[PDB]
Design a protein around this ligand. Structure first.
Ligand SMILES: *[C@@H]1O[C@H](CO)[C@@H](O[C@@H]2O[C@H](CO)[C@@H](O)[C@H](O)[C@H]2NC(C)=O)[C@H](O)[C@H]1NC(C)=O
Ligand SMILES: CCCCCCCCCCCCCCCCS(=O)(=O)O
Ligand SMILES: CCCCCCCCCCCCCCCCS(=O)(=O)O
Ligand SMILES: *[C@@H]1O[C@H](CO)[C@@H](O)[C@H](O)[C@H]1NC(C)=O
Ligand SMILES: [Ca+2]
Ligand SMILES: [Ca+2]
Length: 534
């Protein structure tokens, strides 16, 4: 059976899956339960000696994506599904969920010094777990390429459990617990990966959506100091859909509103110390209270109840400002997007049909935007249905007169144009960028968010050439071009550069293009980034 002797002398046993060897469910932190709730993770102090790690542990508690303080069918329906004994069995979750998984090529031994790809899952900082991201496809392809890599994934707390904010959390120093879970896992990798055959100096961090934004936060963490015991925790990063988070401070307006609401929901509205009151309620009570705060699919949509927020200590300031000021780790990166990131999320506001309703929804969502800014946004992202997302689909997909428009805004501010802003200011290392149009023609959604996960972990498609091959070559040589693709991937310097600067994907394969689309929207959005923060 696969075996590894940890840093502390413990010898653990893994699972031989023939095509790979896996050590699943290794605890890396003490269970963040009871009075440890919402607090920084504590290193796991214990003996794993003689233990087997052959199964993924439970995921952290999950929030109902349709959750909200209102009562409705979608909410009721998902809750029915999520509280079912069958669901509970196929997808177990718990507050004791801080585990890490290591999967490697068969026959890998300590000292192999293989590059390490550390995965951070997406899920709108509200749902997610490591078990739904099979590494077999990545690993198998890495062996066939003669560029074997070791795959590592870490669970982290999501929703209220991991991203609670407000005055109290700030005062306590407990901001961004979920990001701190990810950081500890990185330290565990630095300390223990050599035992599994990986090289701690060849770690590439990567993630999708919420995970991609997590990677960005890790680049910006501690003002760019990514070292642990005198050595950097990662040498590169891959960002699949997501750059800086456009959020106000942890003690800002919305961070405080959500905290108070959750507190009222849990029955802590009258406590003098709501935080200690929240630590005392049962898991069921807390879970209920959380499902009564907006989930990412509810009307509020991407104005998330829980997400990374600057705290003045680990994330010292507005993330857009950190990027302009050079406060980041200096590493080579790959950051890309799916053509139609906002369509799925745009389905959350299908009761908005007129321009007057659109303007009001935008006003409600962006509390810091002036009417002039709102008017500018609505000029840059017009009612014209041929102009919205799914992009380039003409009069098709008109679920409502505003859907394609709202989808265009959501995708651009949340991901696509945010990426361009990062790329235009980042001088930390070499940059590579891609844009996928692999699913052009798919009704309603187009090349929507997360489809890349399918072509990276489940099915093979033209996109796999990038999601697997190119990514593996980057993690190995810090240049995606060593993958030996037919289309050379050009370095990205700025969006105003002459010549193609984007690697592109369609159903047939790869080709290059330019990152010069929707320049009007970019200015509308980023002339003053803080006007559109949540
Ligand atoms: C679309 O539906 C949403 C969600 O139900 C409406 O917003 C809610 O409206 C009720 C009644 O006014 C309020 O008590 C809730 O607080 C609202 N929820 C949120 C998250 O804001 C919204 O008004 C509808 N939009 C349109 C244009 O009809
Ligand atoms: C057998 C079950 C039926 C399956 C229906 C699948 C088609 C409809 C949904 C297609 C998109 C899948 C959700 C991605 C959301 C990623 S984010 O983060 O929201
Ligand atoms: C008009 C509605 C309000 C829109 C606000 C948009 C700006 C705030 C974006 C906040 C980060 C959202 C990250 C979602 C990850 C989705 S994955 O799939 O994990
Ligand atoms: C957060 O910031 C403080 C102040 O610089 C630092 O001591 C602490 O170690 C940081 N936490 C992490 C996980 O890096
Ligand atoms: Ca308060
Ligand atoms: Ca710097």
């Amino acid at each position: 059976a696969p075996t590894a002797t940890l840093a502390n002398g413990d010898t653990i046993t893994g699972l031989n899956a023939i095509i790979n060897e896996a050590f699943l469910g290794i605890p890396f932190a003490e269970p963040p339960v009871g009075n440890l709730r919402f607090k920084d993770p504590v290193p796991y102090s214990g003996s794993l000696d003689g233990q087997k790690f052959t199964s993924y542990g439970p995921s952290c508690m999950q929030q109902n994506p349709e959750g909200t303080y209102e009562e409705n069918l979608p909410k009721a329906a998902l809750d029915l599904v999520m509280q079912s004994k069958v669901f509970e069995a196929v997808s177990p979750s718990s507050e004791d969920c801080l585990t890490i998984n290591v999967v490697r090529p068969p026959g890998t031994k300590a000292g192999a010094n293989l590059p390490v790809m550390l995965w951070i899952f997406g899920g709108g900082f509200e749902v997610g777990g490591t078990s739904t991201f099979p590494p077999a496809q990545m690993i198998t392809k890495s062996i066939a390429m003669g560029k074997p890599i070791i795959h590592v994934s870490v669970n982290y707390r999501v929703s209220s459990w991991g991203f609670l904010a407000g005055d109290e959390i700030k005062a306590e120093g407990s901001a961004n617990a979920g990001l701190k879970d990810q950081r500890l896992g990185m330290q565990w990798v630095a300390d223990n990966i050599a035992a599994f055959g990986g090289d701690p100096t060849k770690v590439t961090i990567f993630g999708e959506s919420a995970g991609s934004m997590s990677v960005m936060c890790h680049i910006l963490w501690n003002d760019g100091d990514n070292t642990y015991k005198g050595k950097p925790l990662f040498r590169a990063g891959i960002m699949q859909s997501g750059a800086m988070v456009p959020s106000d401070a942890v003690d800002g307006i919305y961070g405080n509103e959500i905290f108070d609401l959750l507190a009222s929901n849990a029955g802590c509205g009258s406590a003098s110390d709501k935080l200690a009151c929240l630590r005392g309620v049962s898991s069921d009570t807390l879970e209920d209270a959380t499902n009564n705060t907006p989930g990412f699919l509810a009307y509020s949509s991407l104005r998330l109840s829980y997400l990374p927020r600057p705290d003045g200590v680990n994330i010292t300031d507005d993330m857009y400002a950190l990027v302009r000021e050079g406060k980041y780790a200096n590493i080579p990166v790959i950051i890309g997007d799916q053509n139609d990131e906002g369509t799925f999320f745009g389905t959350s506001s299908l009761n908005v049909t007129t321009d007057a309703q659109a303007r009001e929804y935008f006003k409600q969502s962006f509390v810091h935007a002036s009417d002039a800014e709102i008017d500018t946004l609505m000029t840059a992202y017009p009612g014209d249905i041929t102009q919205g997302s799914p992009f380039d689909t003409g009069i098709l997909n008109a679920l409502t007169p505003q859907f394609k428009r709202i989808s265009a805004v959501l995708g651009d501010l949340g991901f696509t144009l945010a990426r361009r802003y990062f790329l235009n200011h980042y001088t930390g290392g070499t940059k590579y960028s891609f844009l996928s149009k692999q699913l052009s023609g798919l009704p309603v959604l187009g090349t929507f968010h997360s489809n890349d996960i399918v072509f990276q972990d489940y099915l093979l498609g033209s996109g796999s050439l990038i999601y697997n091959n190119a990514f593996i070559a980057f993690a190995t040589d810090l240049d995606p071009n060593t993958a030996g693709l037919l289309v050379k991937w050009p370095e990205y310097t700025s969006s105003s550069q002459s010549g193609n600067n984007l690697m592109m994907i369609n159903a047939l394969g790869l080709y290059t293009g330019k990152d010069n689309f929707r320049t009007a929207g970019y200015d509308a959005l980023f002339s003053n980034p803080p006007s559109f923060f949540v």
